[PDB]
Amino acid sequence: SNAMRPFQVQIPQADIDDLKRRLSETRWPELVDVGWSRGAPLSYIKELAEYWRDGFDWRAAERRINQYPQFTTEIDGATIHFLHVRSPEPDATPMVITHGWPGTPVEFLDIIGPLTDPRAHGGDPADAFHLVIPSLPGFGLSGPLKSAGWELGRIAMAWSKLMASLGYERYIAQGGDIGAFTSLLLGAIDPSHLAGIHVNLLQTNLSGEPGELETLSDADKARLAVSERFLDDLSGPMKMQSTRPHTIGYMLNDSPVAQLAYLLEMFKHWAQTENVPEDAVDRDLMLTHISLFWFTATGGSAAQAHYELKPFLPITSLIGRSPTLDVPMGVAVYPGALFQPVRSLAERDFKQIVHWAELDRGGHFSAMEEPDLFVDDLRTFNRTLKKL
């Protein structure tokens, strides 16, 4: 292991200076206006980039992150950054909340207060959590990688180490996308140190077998079919990163408008929106998240995740049973999520689902998009555990 070194976000003035420079100097491509059908439209990204240049306040954003204790350490040869927010309730339940690609901890800013100091927010002090919010190896404030092989089981092995080093003998593992797989595998590695696992995004695979795609109501079949859209329309980024993540790095690292355009795909389509990204996620919060990728120069290091996680990717396979998991588990189903899980397929592999939530609003970035929902849902799950 290593030690926990206090950390603050401190973007050099010169880096802020270059970013403005590069934005000014953008060579705008000449593209036909087809709305959002082929990527971000010129009108939108151009006035968004002017704002990023001329209105957005990185230092204010930086202070909003730094209100929270952060640390870095070194584990199995990555530096890992994390927020560590202790509740004023000493008996709060510890929970690690792990983002996915293209995630950051700023997804979680709006849930931190209500989860950690429910008492202040007019809530039930018994419902409090202690929070650990790491940035994945190679992502964002964890910084780029200097060696690779960060497969899933290695991330999860590292997370178990982190929680033990922090002193947490009983914790909840929460996440979606890479964070959901990480939490599920911790189920295998730390069954005993686990109060439970909670996933807000869940791919349920058919097994590939006789007795199955038969029992499934028409509604389940349509839920499985949802995946076709991500598959058809939204998986270019994953296919690229799964094969040539260095190439993606060169395509993100030297143009902030490229970095912006690429990530606007997720904020338009993975998030639950109607007319634009800001209907789901505040403009400044989104730009904070995106700027984190730009300043830390982790477009390429973060892309490595799909190359490493190939076997798990929804573009490599949707078929097969997962190992049986017996840790108490909870699912929240968000309607804008790119995959839509069928509980009977989940129950096939998970022996102890004690909580299943179907929310009415919100997409892929569930906590960021609908923090009040997510808070309520996590508190309910936490209650259900405490009775087990």
Next chain:
Amino acid sequence: SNAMRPFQVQIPQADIDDLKRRLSETRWPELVDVGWSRGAPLSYIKELAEYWRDGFDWRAAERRINQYPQFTTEIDGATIHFLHVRSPEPDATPMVITHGWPGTPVEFLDIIGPLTDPRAHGGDPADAFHLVIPSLPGFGLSGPLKSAGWELGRIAMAWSKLMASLGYERYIAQGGDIGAFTSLLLGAIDPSHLAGIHVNLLQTNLSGEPGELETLSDADKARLAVSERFLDDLSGPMKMQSTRPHTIGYMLNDSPVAQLAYLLEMFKHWAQTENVPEDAVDRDLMLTHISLFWFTATGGSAAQAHYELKPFLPITSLIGRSPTLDVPMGVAVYPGALFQPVRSLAERDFKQIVHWAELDRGGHFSAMEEPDLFVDDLRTFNRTLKKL
């Protein structure tokens, strides 16, 4: 139709100036050295970019293109650029040679002399061609698009118009990749104005039927299997462009190292190489081709092709019969080609294949990589026609 306006490549000094500027100012991404497995390695692309900065001579390249008469015109609402190189043999056979994505006419510089003035090159004056070498709508020197809907049949409809406007009543349509589909469809549109079609890259689909994947020797099956590699490893760019070509535009348009990294994928892996791109294609010729995309700012306009050509793409389907074609046709099979065609599957749909060549060396950019082969092969095909 419109007129044929004489054209020369004339890149503004200020554009050359910015390119050097941007190369100097590249923010290099921090990536682990894994050779070429995940994209271009740092060592290679960095010294290649220094050369592009400090050694490569665009003006010399520009003069090498401008030794050739060029024109632009306006057809069905695209400006289309083309080389038009008349043979000193007035009775030469006219041939249009059409590139694919990510193609340019500089692929063909080394074949122009021997095809058009065989007499000078110590060859058979009877074997001469007149050449038309267009840049596809939205590609390179044709410039970016200002409206879209450039599906295949529209490109081919435009090509038939161009050849008629140039005065060519009997011509060969040659190409691979988008150029092969274009030539095959001209088979449908201009059967009578066609001497023949020649394709150097050919996807042969199974029909989907009982009587077929059975007659096929083990060797044919392995030829069909080749496709798995492009599919598995090389199709991220196509999947991106097929869904979000504007996003690709933003990722190419504002960083020359991004534009370079992206296209090095094809020059390493689509071309037939061992250790590096320059084993297949001279470094300066390659940089000329890539610089053409950079200066014309057609990374995004060219990407539109896959979005438009979705139904034809090898990532959407490998299955189905094509319409029956009865125009005399010739195939050349290059061993580094990403798809490997089975003649019995080709014969299923093509009623008059009169020439089938299996070459020993060369990949995707067949003429650029092995111009002597390609010349010999085209002359042989031309002979075979003339006897029909």
